[PDB]
Design a binder for this molecule. Structure first.
Ligand SMILES: CO/C(CO[C@H]1O[C@H](C)[C@@H](OC)[C@H](OC)[C@@H]1O)=C1\O[C@H](Oc2ccc(/C=C(\C)C(=O)N[C@H]3[C@@H](O)[C@H](n4cnc5c(N(C)C)ncnc54)O[C@@H]3CO)cc2)[C@@H](O)[C@@H]1O
Ligand SMILES: *C(=O)[C@H](CCSC)NC=O
Ligand SMILES: [K+]
Ligand SMILES: [Mg+2]
Ligand SMILES: [Mg+2]
Ligand SMILES: [Mg+2]
Ligand SMILES: [Mg+2]
Ligand SMILES: [Mg+2]
Ligand SMILES: [Mg+2]
Ligand SMILES: [Mg+2]
Ligand SMILES: [Mg+2]
Ligand SMILES: [Mg+2]
Ligand SMILES: [Mg+2]
Ligand SMILES: [Mg+2]
Ligand SMILES: [Mg+2]
Ligand SMILES: [Mg+2]
Ligand SMILES: [Mg+2]
Ligand SMILES: [Mg+2]
Ligand SMILES: [Mg+2]
Ligand SMILES: [Mg+2]
Ligand SMILES: [Mg+2]
Ligand SMILES: [Mg+2]
Ligand SMILES: [Mg+2]
Ligand SMILES: [Mg+2]
Ligand SMILES: [Mg+2]
Ligand SMILES: [Mg+2]
Ligand SMILES: [Mg+2]
Ligand SMILES: [Mg+2]
Ligand SMILES: [Mg+2]
Ligand SMILES: [Mg+2]
Ligand SMILES: [Mg+2]
Ligand SMILES: [Mg+2]
Ligand SMILES: [Mg+2]
Ligand SMILES: [Mg+2]
Ligand SMILES: [Mg+2]
Ligand SMILES: [Mg+2]
Ligand SMILES: [Mg+2]
Ligand SMILES: [Mg+2]
Ligand SMILES: [Mg+2]
Ligand SMILES: [Mg+2]
Ligand SMILES: [Mg+2]
Ligand SMILES: [Mg+2]
Ligand SMILES: [Mg+2]
Ligand SMILES: [Mg+2]
Ligand SMILES: [Mg+2]
Ligand SMILES: [Mg+2]
Ligand SMILES: [Mg+2]
Ligand SMILES: [Mg+2]
Ligand SMILES: [Mg+2]
Ligand SMILES: [Mg+2]
Ligand SMILES: [Mg+2]
Ligand SMILES: [Mg+2]
Ligand SMILES: [Mg+2]
Ligand SMILES: [Mg+2]
Ligand SMILES: [Mg+2]
Ligand SMILES: [Mg+2]
Ligand SMILES: [Mg+2]
Ligand SMILES: [Mg+2]
Ligand SMILES: [Mg+2]
Ligand SMILES: [Mg+2]
Ligand SMILES: [Mg+2]
Ligand SMILES: [Mg+2]
Ligand SMILES: [Mg+2]
Ligand SMILES: [Mg+2]
Ligand SMILES: [Mg+2]
Ligand SMILES: [Mg+2]
Ligand SMILES: [Mg+2]
Ligand SMILES: [Mg+2]
Ligand SMILES: [Mg+2]
Ligand SMILES: [Mg+2]
Ligand SMILES: [Mg+2]
Ligand SMILES: [Mg+2]
Ligand SMILES: [Mg+2]
Ligand SMILES: [Mg+2]
Ligand SMILES: [Mg+2]
Ligand SMILES: [Mg+2]
Ligand SMILES: [Mg+2]
Ligand SMILES: [Mg+2]
Ligand SMILES: [Mg+2]
Ligand SMILES: [Mg+2]
Ligand SMILES: [Mg+2]
Ligand SMILES: [Mg+2]
Ligand SMILES: [Mg+2]
Ligand SMILES: [Mg+2]
Ligand SMILES: [Mg+2]
Ligand SMILES: [Mg+2]
Ligand SMILES: [Mg+2]
Ligand SMILES: [Mg+2]
Ligand SMILES: [Mg+2]
Ligand SMILES: [Mg+2]
Ligand SMILES: [Mg+2]
Ligand SMILES: [Mg+2]
Ligand SMILES: [Mg+2]
Ligand SMILES: [Mg+2]
Ligand SMILES: [Mg+2]
Ligand SMILES: [Mg+2]
Ligand SMILES: [Mg+2]
Ligand SMILES: [Mg+2]
Ligand SMILES: [Mg+2]
Ligand SMILES: [Mg+2]
Ligand SMILES: [Mg+2]
Ligand SMILES: [Mg+2]
Ligand SMILES: [Mg+2]
Ligand SMILES: [Mg+2]
Ligand SMILES: [Mg+2]
Ligand SMILES: [Mg+2]
Ligand SMILES: [Mg+2]
Ligand SMILES: [Mg+2]
Ligand SMILES: [Mg+2]
Ligand SMILES: [Mg+2]
Ligand SMILES: [Mg+2]
Ligand SMILES: [Mg+2]
Ligand SMILES: [Mg+2]
Ligand SMILES: [Mg+2]
Ligand SMILES: [Mg+2]
Ligand SMILES: [Mg+2]
Ligand SMILES: [Mg+2]
Ligand SMILES: [Mg+2]
Ligand SMILES: [Mg+2]
Ligand SMILES: [Mg+2]
Ligand SMILES: [Mg+2]
Ligand SMILES: [Mg+2]
Ligand SMILES: [Mg+2]
Ligand SMILES: [Mg+2]
Ligand SMILES: [Mg+2]
Ligand SMILES: [Mg+2]
Ligand SMILES: [Mg+2]
Ligand SMILES: [Mg+2]
Ligand SMILES: [Mg+2]
Ligand SMILES: [Mg+2]
Ligand SMILES: [Mg+2]
Ligand SMILES: [Mg+2]
Ligand SMILES: [Mg+2]
Ligand SMILES: [Mg+2]
Ligand SMILES: [Mg+2]
Ligand SMILES: [Mg+2]
Ligand SMILES: [Mg+2]
Ligand SMILES: [Mg+2]
Ligand SMILES: [Mg+2]
Ligand SMILES: [Mg+2]
Ligand SMILES: [Mg+2]
Ligand SMILES: [Mg+2]
Ligand SMILES: [Mg+2]
Ligand SMILES: [Mg+2]
Ligand SMILES: [Mg+2]
Ligand SMILES: [Mg+2]
Ligand SMILES: [Mg+2]
Ligand SMILES: [Mg+2]
Ligand SMILES: [Mg+2]
Ligand SMILES: [Mg+2]
Ligand SMILES: [Mg+2]
Ligand SMILES: [Mg+2]
Ligand SMILES: [Mg+2]
Ligand SMILES: [Mg+2]
Ligand SMILES: [Mg+2]
Ligand SMILES: [Mg+2]
Ligand SMILES: [Mg+2]
Ligand SMILES: [Mg+2]
Ligand SMILES: [Mg+2]
Ligand SMILES: [Mg+2]
Ligand SMILES: [Mg+2]
Ligand SMILES: [Mg+2]
Ligand SMILES: [Mg+2]
Ligand SMILES: [Mg+2]
Ligand SMILES: [Mg+2]
Ligand SMILES: [Mg+2]
Ligand SMILES: [Mg+2]
Ligand SMILES: [Mg+2]
Ligand SMILES: [Mg+2]
Ligand SMILES: [Mg+2]
Ligand SMILES: [Mg+2]
Ligand SMILES: [Mg+2]
Ligand SMILES: [Mg+2]
Ligand SMILES: [Mg+2]
Ligand SMILES: [Mg+2]
Ligand SMILES: [Mg+2]
Ligand SMILES: [Mg+2]
Ligand SMILES: [Mg+2]
Ligand SMILES: [Mg+2]
Ligand SMILES: [Mg+2]
Ligand SMILES: [Mg+2]
Ligand SMILES: [Mg+2]
Ligand SMILES: [Mg+2]
Ligand SMILES: [Mg+2]
Ligand SMILES: [Mg+2]
Ligand SMILES: [Mg+2]
Ligand SMILES: [Mg+2]
Ligand SMILES: [Mg+2]
Ligand SMILES: [Mg+2]
Ligand SMILES: [Mg+2]
Ligand SMILES: [Mg+2]
Ligand SMILES: [Mg+2]
Ligand SMILES: [Mg+2]
Ligand SMILES: [Mg+2]
Ligand SMILES: [Mg+2]
Ligand SMILES: [Mg+2]
Ligand SMILES: [Mg+2]
Ligand SMILES: [Mg+2]
Ligand SMILES: [Mg+2]
Ligand SMILES: [Mg+2]
Ligand SMILES: [Mg+2]
Ligand SMILES: [Mg+2]
Ligand SMILES: [Mg+2]
Ligand SMILES: [Mg+2]
Ligand SMILES: [Mg+2]
Ligand SMILES: [Mg+2]
Ligand SMILES: [Mg+2]
Ligand SMILES: [Mg+2]
Ligand SMILES: [Mg+2]
Ligand SMILES: [Mg+2]
Ligand SMILES: [Mg+2]
Ligand SMILES: [Mg+2]
Ligand SMILES: [Mg+2]
Ligand SMILES: [Mg+2]
Lengths: 48, 275
RNA sequence: GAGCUAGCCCUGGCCAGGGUGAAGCUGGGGUGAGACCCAGUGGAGGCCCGAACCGGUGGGGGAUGCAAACCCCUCGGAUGA
RNA sequence: GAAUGCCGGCAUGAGUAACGAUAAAGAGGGUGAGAAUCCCUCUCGCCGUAAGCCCAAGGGUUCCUACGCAAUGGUCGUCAGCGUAGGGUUAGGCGGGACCUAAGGUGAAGCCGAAAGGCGUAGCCGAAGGGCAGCCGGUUAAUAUUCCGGCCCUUCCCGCAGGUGCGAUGGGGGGACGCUCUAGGCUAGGGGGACCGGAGCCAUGGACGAGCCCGGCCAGAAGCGCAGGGUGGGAGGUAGGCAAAUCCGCCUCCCAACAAGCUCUGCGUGGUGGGGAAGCCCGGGUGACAACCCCCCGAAGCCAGGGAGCCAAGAAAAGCCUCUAAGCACAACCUGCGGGAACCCGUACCGCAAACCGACACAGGUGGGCGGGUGCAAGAGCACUCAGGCGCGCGGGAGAACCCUCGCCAAGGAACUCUGCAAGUUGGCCCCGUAACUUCGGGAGAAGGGGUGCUCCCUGGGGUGAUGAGCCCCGGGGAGCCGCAGUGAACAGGCUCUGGCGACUGUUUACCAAAAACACAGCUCUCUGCGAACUCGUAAGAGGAGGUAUAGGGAGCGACGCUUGCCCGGUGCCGGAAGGUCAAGGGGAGGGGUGCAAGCCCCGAACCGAAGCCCCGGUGAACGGCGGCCGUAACUAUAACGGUCCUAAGGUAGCGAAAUUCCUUGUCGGGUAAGUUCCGACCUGCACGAAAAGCGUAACGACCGGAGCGCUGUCUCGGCGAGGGACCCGGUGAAAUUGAACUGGCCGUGAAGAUGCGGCCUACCCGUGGCAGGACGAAAAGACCCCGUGGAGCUUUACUGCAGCC
RNA sequence: CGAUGUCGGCUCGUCGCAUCCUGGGGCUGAAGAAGGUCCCAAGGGUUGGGCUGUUCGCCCAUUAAAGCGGCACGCGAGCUG
RNA sequence: UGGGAGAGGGUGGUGGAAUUCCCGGAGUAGCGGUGAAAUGCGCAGAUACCGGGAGGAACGCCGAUGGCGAAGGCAGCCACCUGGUCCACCCGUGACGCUGAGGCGCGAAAGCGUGGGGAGCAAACCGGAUUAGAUACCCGGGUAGUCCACGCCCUAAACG
RNA sequence: CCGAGGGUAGGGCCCGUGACUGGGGCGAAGUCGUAACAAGGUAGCUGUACCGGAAGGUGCGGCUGGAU
RNA sequence: GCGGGGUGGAGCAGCCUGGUAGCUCGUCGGGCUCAUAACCCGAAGGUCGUCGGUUCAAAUCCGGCCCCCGCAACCA
């Protein structure tokens, strides 16, 4: 049947993207945390 | 003079449509239309604040002149009468001798190719607009300003009208469409005649789908819900109201007056409404 | 977190073929004038049959599955909420 | 040593299930250490509105070539979407950006919020919408509207010529719009040709033929032709389009008004450039100087911004054209010609799937376009088949039970069973015919029946063309032929009677309920005078609504028909400037503390004092409620009648053993041989009843009852047959479960149901196909039940708070 | 209660005997026939339908007869629901 | 041809008296109602009186034993539109007449549908009296309806 | 070919009959009330509407076949 | 199981709070009327379901018994 993950590069970037995260207090603390933990990528990969 | 249909479908058996006989022009005046932004009953928060709205036919807003004291003494000819999907009334196209074109809601009995005019010294004829103070007591009137220069607020729906009952200082007494007896300032403009399309209320929608065309989504009864949803929710099987009949938000809906008591306009409302 | 799902908004797209034959219009008849009757034309409809498409009624199968809801037969809607 | 402990390792089940659609294979020849599985050939089968082809998402080198086979591939592997390496994606015209706006997002000005932040006009961003200039063919192992060939076109810069009041983010026009139906003329595509071109073929009884087989085009500037779209011309006045305006709007006058003219697209033709089959040789060559023509069918695509009808009344902005303002009129813009200039990103490949979403090379899911031919009335249905693509990554045997999917069955024909569940029957088209009832539409495909192929003769009308031949499309009549059978295959209703519920088409518990539930038009009550009520928000601000009582909110009821009784004592809502109570506050009789005292400080009666409550009324389609006992008629029985008590008032019409009736399978009637169900009645209604509506109602229903006809493997009652499994052999090889086990029966005993204790009996050791009585078999720390001063949802005249409102 | 699935049907039986029939008896208010009652006897047999979920029961048509019980109210790793 | 009386019909308009409700003023202990009462109303200020406003229905005197119409029926006043009818003159047509099964139209009240309207009155209904009872007659309330528009119904002691 | 008639299916008319149900007629001495005839103790009758154990009552309009 | 009830002939007060039985109707007697009903004037009638008990004293308060109404009978 139709499953839940239905990829969309524009959707991904506008939802979870760097610029999305920076526009918000909670979003910015996500980046802060992920940097502090030392994540190799702070934001989902998407091909633009 | 509403139109009927033969019972060749179940729904078509009860349906009635307007006779559209007054309409003489079937596309709007392009410089006088702008897009009507459909809300679906959602506010700027994106929240439903008026339940059961949406999905109706696309519409173009016809810009309506609810002022008229704009062009005092400048006569106009009634160029056409058209359909307006945003209101019950019909609208009349006015070609001012000024070269200006403008919409008003069409009063009853108004004919294309007649002259209309606005101002203190305008004749008492259907289609004209005057300050209330200059209109003869006893005259039926529509598109009435409530306060001066603020715009026509009163009696704009199809077939509605207000009647001048008397005068008192700078104010005149109106009998509103509701039956309320109210004081309205004498400087308030108002158009003589009743709003047209009085047979509007005799229309029988005929089927569920016709509600949907009008942007009216299905209304679900509180009794059909659960207690999380509504005061009348739940109950094993059908249930009587079992408490004073209420709205989704808890307040009583059978008689409970809701007009704010300390409202300043109380000093101007003489008698509360009719039936 | 509304890339599943529910609603609404904006902009596009889709619905083989066949059947029924509303109003209207024209002519004919009728009448003081009418209503109305007949025929032709006309092509209405949450109209009818039926693919695509949207479903999921009954039964069978599957049940460490092909599948954490599927498969077969059958069945509902298919110009419309 | 135990925690259904944690991590890891390794066992058991077991050579067991399985190896992922039953579209299907066989052989010959290659290659190689090794071949059912790789390559080639022939034969066979499968898809062909797809299982072919193109595009968009998503994916991200998977593309092509060489070299490999440890792992990946459900087997094998020499092969591969796998490993290594090298190569491959080329644009002014295709798509997106250097253009435009949509929702929405953002957001100078402005507003609001303890902070973080929330709003918000203009503007800006935002696309599969608008706008915008490239078509045919060739070429590579792999790219091509990109490279190349031919033939075209756009913008920008500059220059030349000619023209003009040039000039804009400003004004105006335009862009610019729905749904259904649809005309004319074309194109796409297709059928045929006795015509044109072609390697060849004559078989096996016949055919050297007006034979068979193959093909018979594509693109193309200007001009021309056919078909369409768009668009009146001139003058005078002007106060409106937020400056101006010769523009646009308005008024008047004249001319032209189904036209023409001008303009703009489609199609045709068109210099020219391309393509070009079978077959036969080895993707290439030839065929070939290939031919490239005529007739028919014909779109849903084109002309297009076409037409008509209808109500539910159908984006914006730019490009473009026109107007003027500053300014400038040595300019500048317009037109033609010429040269120069023309950037960034994508382009491989998969793309209904083995490369996307489903952990898998997963019978699932995934938007758009093209989708040939014949026949069946049509069609994208169905059967076959073209181009093209496949035989689904374990096989070989066997021919048991049993399972699935399928075929047939004597006699009977629902006797099966909760139930005709299931499966039969029926089945398309044409014609005949068709009942109650009805809201006059319907019910209707009612029911029921007849016809259906092929041949010969005669004949009517239409499209095209020419008015004719040919082609193609609808028909009518006669005479015949064959079969068991003519919609000969495939696709394609079983029907009738009668209740209950719901009017109706719709909607729902994604994944156990599709219904009588929700919705629904319609009906009523009620709130709301507009800065509306109401809703979201602390707020600003929004929705309501750019609406205005024929409108908007809330509630119940639920098409329609005939109707909807009585009770206002209690709760609610509505009204009531009296009275009663009432908080802070006002008041200050009278006290108190302290000081030597002026004073400072504390308490404080009457009385004035709001909403609320009390109090007086109203109100039922507001919450709701609508009696008991006893007696009475000239047979009896029963009580129209009466007596009395109680209530706020004592249930009306209609209906009634009901989706409601306990006793109950009430009683009686109908149907049956027989009827706890069903239908019709009766009425002592345990416990109907009037908008939580009452009683009906044509039509409707994958709803739930009951009956009948038709037909059947449902059954009596089973039999045979087919394929996929099951079985045997080669290959690969799980699982839950498992204290260990050397694990019988009976009668007892035992914590009360013993392989395991007693006594007896029976029993050689080990497997394979099978069946399920037991191992209180497995799975899941029982959902029921209780317990816990355990939890959560829900309710209220439980308690206590808070929003909100007064 | 870290699960002993449950009415009825179906299928498959097997056992008990307080015996429904068939076999053998005594007594009879047993003339014969046909009954009643009691004894012995478990070898075999013990029908098909209408109603209802039913077990049971009522009914229809037959029969030699249309028996009653146990087996986790036998039997869902056998099916139904 | 000329002339006449009339509530004949239809449409639009409009005038006064009265009832009721509402606002204001003044004023106080009752009003109302009947056979007699009670219910009801009233110190929360009623009844009675004055000013103002809204609204609906009906038209006093003229009015008659009258007029008009086919009947049902028609009554303030005004305008428009329109039917029937009588008289006079003796001008025109030249039997063109009478009746009329069917058909068609009209048709009081009540009643029905859809909107409106609603003062007074008032089925139903409630209450107070009477009575053995009183589902009545009398009293206080009171919903349809009475009124308008359009569409139905088509009855009558539609009688002379 | 026609054809008596047989068969299948579906309509129309008529008769008989049916649990039960509706009123009707009749029946020496039943129960309740007293509507009409006198102004019948509310003049009656009336068409229609609603209501009531029952006659009836009431509304709206009509008739005199109404007493005064 | 829980609650309520039994009193002149009928239907109801009295019980709670011990001493006292009452209201309407009916029945009997007289009146009015030609007569009956209505109406009017008088009057009779219970000894409180039954058996115990508390008490000076019981319809009354407590207990047992018999009836009579209403409510309840739920989870599997
Ligand atoms: C019942 O639950 C279970 C088993 O559950 C397991 O299996 C289930 C199938 C699973 O369900 C998904 C479950 O998963 C959780 C679990 O694995 C268990 O409880 C078992 O213990 C039992 C307890 C009670 C019962 C029977 C009960 C509660 C009962 O009420 N029986 C009634 C009813 O069946 C039957 N009955 C009375 N009325 C009528 C009647 N009427 C009213 C007309 N008409 C007809 N049948 C009537 O009568 C019986 C006795 O009176 C049976 C077993 C235990 O051994 C077993 O593990
Ligand atoms: C009672 O029978 C119960 C039924 C479950 S109801 C959720 N099961 C008992 O074992
Ligand atoms: K339970
Ligand atoms: Mg996932
Ligand atoms: Mg998606
Ligand atoms: Mg994207
Ligand atoms: Mg997106
Ligand atoms: Mg972002
Ligand atoms: Mg890194
Ligand atoms: Mg990581
Ligand atoms: Mg209609
Ligand atoms: Mg109109
Ligand atoms: Mg615009
Ligand atoms: Mg916003
Ligand atoms: Mg937001
Ligand atoms: Mg709302
Ligand atoms: Mg909404
Ligand atoms: Mg309109
Ligand atoms: Mg005002
Ligand atoms: Mg209308
Ligand atoms: Mg609409
Ligand atoms: Mg609803
Ligand atoms: Mg609701
Ligand atoms: Mg509910
Ligand atoms: Mg619910
Ligand atoms: Mg919620
Ligand atoms: Mg709640
Ligand atoms: Mg409730
Ligand atoms: Mg409920
Ligand atoms: Mg209930
Ligand atoms: Mg419910
Ligand atoms: Mg209720
Ligand atoms: Mg309740
Ligand atoms: Mg509120
Ligand atoms: Mg008001
Ligand atoms: Mg979020
Ligand atoms: Mg979504
Ligand atoms: Mg999405
Ligand atoms: Mg399609
Ligand atoms: Mg036709
Ligand atoms: Mg037409
Ligand atoms: Mg349809
Ligand atoms: Mg299914
Ligand atoms: Mg089936
Ligand atoms: Mg499953
Ligand atoms: Mg399937
Ligand atoms: Mg299927
Ligand atoms: Mg199928
Ligand atoms: Mg269909
Ligand atoms: Mg739609
Ligand atoms: Mg230990
Ligand atoms: Mg474990
Ligand atoms: Mg543990
Ligand atoms: Mg572990
Ligand atoms: Mg192992
Ligand atoms: Mg092993
Ligand atoms: Mg095994
Ligand atoms: Mg496979
Ligand atoms: Mg498998
Ligand atoms: Mg191999
Ligand atoms: Mg090999
Ligand atoms: Mg193979
Ligand atoms: Mg090969
Ligand atoms: Mg095909
Ligand atoms: Mg991937
Ligand atoms: Mg390998
Ligand atoms: Mg290998
Ligand atoms: Mg290697
Ligand atoms: Mg592998
Ligand atoms: Mg695999
Ligand atoms: Mg090799
Ligand atoms: Mg190029
Ligand atoms: Mg640039
Ligand atoms: Mg922009
Ligand atoms: Mg774009
Ligand atoms: Mg558009
Ligand atoms: Mg482009
Ligand atoms: Mg120029
Ligand atoms: Mg210019
Ligand atoms: Mg410009
Ligand atoms: Mg527009
Ligand atoms: Mg339409
Ligand atoms: Mg055409
Ligand atoms: Mg072409
Ligand atoms: Mg063809
Ligand atoms: Mg021969
Ligand atoms: Mg100007
Ligand atoms: Mg070639
Ligand atoms: Mg050559
Ligand atoms: Mg058009
Ligand atoms: Mg200047
Ligand atoms: Mg650049
Ligand atoms: Mg490419
Ligand atoms: Mg592809
Ligand atoms: Mg698929
Ligand atoms: Mg596709
Ligand atoms: Mg693939
Ligand atoms: Mg995936
Ligand atoms: Mg595979
Ligand atoms: Mg797949
Ligand atoms: Mg067909
Ligand atoms: Mg295969
Ligand atoms: Mg396949
Ligand atoms: Mg057979
Ligand atoms: Mg038969
Ligand atoms: Mg049966
Ligand atoms: Mg059945
Ligand atoms: Mg079936
Ligand atoms: Mg069949
Ligand atoms: Mg068929
Ligand atoms: Mg009919
Ligand atoms: Mg029909
Ligand atoms: Mg048929
Ligand atoms: Mg043949
Ligand atoms: Mg087939
Ligand atoms: Mg069919
Ligand atoms: Mg029933
Ligand atoms: Mg339903
Ligand atoms: Mg339904
Ligand atoms: Mg119903
Ligand atoms: Mg309905
Ligand atoms: Mg409905
Ligand atoms: Mg479900
Ligand atoms: Mg569920
Ligand atoms: Mg789910
Ligand atoms: Mg299901
Ligand atoms: Mg359904
Ligand atoms: Mg309704
Ligand atoms: Mg809020
Ligand atoms: Mg707005
Ligand atoms: Mg509303
Ligand atoms: Mg209510
Ligand atoms: Mg509903
Ligand atoms: Mg309902
Ligand atoms: Mg009817
Ligand atoms: Mg009440
Ligand atoms: Mg009250
Ligand atoms: Mg009350
Ligand atoms: Mg006072
Ligand atoms: Mg104080
Ligand atoms: Mg109550
Ligand atoms: Mg009362
Ligand atoms: Mg009643
Ligand atoms: Mg009634
Ligand atoms: Mg009954
Ligand atoms: Mg029954
Ligand atoms: Mg019963
Ligand atoms: Mg029962
Ligand atoms: Mg029975
Ligand atoms: Mg019978
Ligand atoms: Mg049943
Ligand atoms: Mg029945
Ligand atoms: Mg009875
Ligand atoms: Mg209710
Ligand atoms: Mg009903
Ligand atoms: Mg029906
Ligand atoms: Mg259904
Ligand atoms: Mg079988
Ligand atoms: Mg086989
Ligand atoms: Mg092996
Ligand atoms: Mg051992
Ligand atoms: Mg052993
Ligand atoms: Mg024991
Ligand atoms: Mg034992
Ligand atoms: Mg021992
Ligand atoms: Mg032992
Ligand atoms: Mg032993
Ligand atoms: Mg033994
Ligand atoms: Mg073996
Ligand atoms: Mg085995
Ligand atoms: Mg076993
Ligand atoms: Mg076992
Ligand atoms: Mg489990
Ligand atoms: Mg646990
Ligand atoms: Mg537990
Ligand atoms: Mg559990
Ligand atoms: Mg506690
Ligand atoms: Mg405790
Ligand atoms: Mg707790
Ligand atoms: Mg809690
Ligand atoms: Mg247990
Ligand atoms: Mg377990
Ligand atoms: Mg004898
Ligand atoms: Mg035996
Ligand atoms: Mg036996
Ligand atoms: Mg039985
Ligand atoms: Mg029984
Ligand atoms: Mg037992
Ligand atoms: Mg089972
Ligand atoms: Mg069972
Ligand atoms: Mg088991
Ligand atoms: Mg077991
Ligand atoms: Mg069940
Ligand atoms: Mg003469
Ligand atoms: Mg003469
Ligand atoms: Mg006559
Ligand atoms: Mg009439
Ligand atoms: Mg009234
Ligand atoms: Mg008279
Ligand atoms: Mg015969
Ligand atoms: Mg008698
Ligand atoms: Mg009388
Ligand atoms: Mg009398
Ligand atoms: Mg009388
Ligand atoms: Mg009575
Ligand atoms: Mg009465
Ligand atoms: Mg005498
Ligand atoms: Mg005594
Ligand atoms: Mg005593
Ligand atoms: Mg004593
Ligand atoms: Mg005593
Ligand atoms: Mg006593
Ligand atoms: Mg006492
Ligand atoms: Mg419970």
């Amino acid at each position: 049947m139709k499953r839940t993950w239905q990829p969309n590069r524009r959707k991904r970037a506008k939802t979870h993207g760097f610029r999305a995260r920076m526009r918000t207090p909670g979003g910015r603390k996500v980046l802060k945390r992920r940097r502090q933990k030392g994540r190799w990528r702070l934001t989902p990969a998407v091909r633009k | 003079a509403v139109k009927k249909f033969k019972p060749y479908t179940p729904s078509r058996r009860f349906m009635t449509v307007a006779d559209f006989s007054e309409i003489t022009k079937t596309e709007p005046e392009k410089s006088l239309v702008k897009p009507l932004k459909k809300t679906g009953g959602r506010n700027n928060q994106g929240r439903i604040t008026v339940r059961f709205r949406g999905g109706g036919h696309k519409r173009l807003y016809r810009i309506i002149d609810f002022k008229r004291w704009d062009k005092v003494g400048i006569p106009a000819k009634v160029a056409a009468i058209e359909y307006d999907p945003n209101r019950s009334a019909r609208i009349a196209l006015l070609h001012y001798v000024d070269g200006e074109k403008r919409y008003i809601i069409a009063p009853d009995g108004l004919q294309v190719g007649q002259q209309v005019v606005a101002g203190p010294d305008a004749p008492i004829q259907v289609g004209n607009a005057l300050p209330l103070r200059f209109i003869p007591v006893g005259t039926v009137v529509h598109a009435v300003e409530l306060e001066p220069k603020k715009g026509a607020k009163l009696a704009r729906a199809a077939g509605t009208s207000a009647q001048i009952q008397g005068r008192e200082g700078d104010y005149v007494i109106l009998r509103l469409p509701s039956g309320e007896l109210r004081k309205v300032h004498g400087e308030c403009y108002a158009t003589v005649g009743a709003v047209g399309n009085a047979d509007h209320k005799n229309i029988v929608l005929g089927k569920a789908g016709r509600s949907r065309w009008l942007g009216r989504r299905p209304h679900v009864r509180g009794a059909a819900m659960n207690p999380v949803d509504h005061p009348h929710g739940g109950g094993e099987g059908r249930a009587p109201r079992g408490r004073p009949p209420a709205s989704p938000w808890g307040w009583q809906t059978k008689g409970l007056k809701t007009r704010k008591r300390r409202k300043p306009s109380s000093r101007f409302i003489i008698a509360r409404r009719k039936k």
